[PDB]
Amino acid sequence: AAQTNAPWGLARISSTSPGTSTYYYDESAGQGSCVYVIDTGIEASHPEFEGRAQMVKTYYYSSRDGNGHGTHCAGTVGSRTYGVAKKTQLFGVKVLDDNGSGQYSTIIAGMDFVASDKNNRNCPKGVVASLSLGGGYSSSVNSAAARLQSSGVMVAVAAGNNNADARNYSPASEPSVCTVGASDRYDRRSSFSNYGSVLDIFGPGTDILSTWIGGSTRSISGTSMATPHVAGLAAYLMTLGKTTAASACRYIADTANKGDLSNIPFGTVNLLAYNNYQA
């Protein structure tokens, strides 16, 4: 399948080269997979989700995304226009308040929630969790992310936006999950992207168009935007049978575009998420 005039990041994920604008992907499109977006919520009524999104948990007065961040990330995973895996099922877990903040205790509970809740959902092609969030190093947050992964979920987490080594941030620094840095449309490391040995992969993160609340769209930047590209890619590849939740991060690294990015510090992978879709 070909989507013309796609957001640059979608085109990038299906290209060996920067500078193109069509997204190419197998029409299976993540059908039969599930992606949990653990964030500020998801505006499930957005036409872009086509009824494939739902809220399943909140820790706040409402399950509504009163921020937009979670809706944007969900859109990059799985919206019809802005998403990588256009037929996946999206599940929202609102661990962040409408100011985009959440206590680590809440974030941990949300991860353990997903590890159990997947057993209540129909995801025959597998389960992914996208965590476009984090803070300072916490062994408890990392352990929660490790449990979620161990439980059979492909966990993708943001590296963080500190232009610093991700070793000092969580859940970015948990080795066993898929830690995602950000790039721009010219294949530069995004200016804010964290880096370091713990990064597994980069994805598009600067100037990413996706869904927003109030049935709208906007472009924003961050490792929060790169993460759902990778989460959606994992779901897509799992639907194709090319990999599994346990192995998807490694598979994505194996099959990534190598050496394309600039300003990658020595000791950080130079790997850009790529679907290797050949029509």
Binding site: D39, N67, H69, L96, G134, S221, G222, S224
Partner: peptide, 7 residues
């Protein structure tokens, strides 16, 4: 605590 930008 928290995320990366109520972006």
């Amino acid at each position: 605590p928290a995320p990366f930008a109520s972006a």
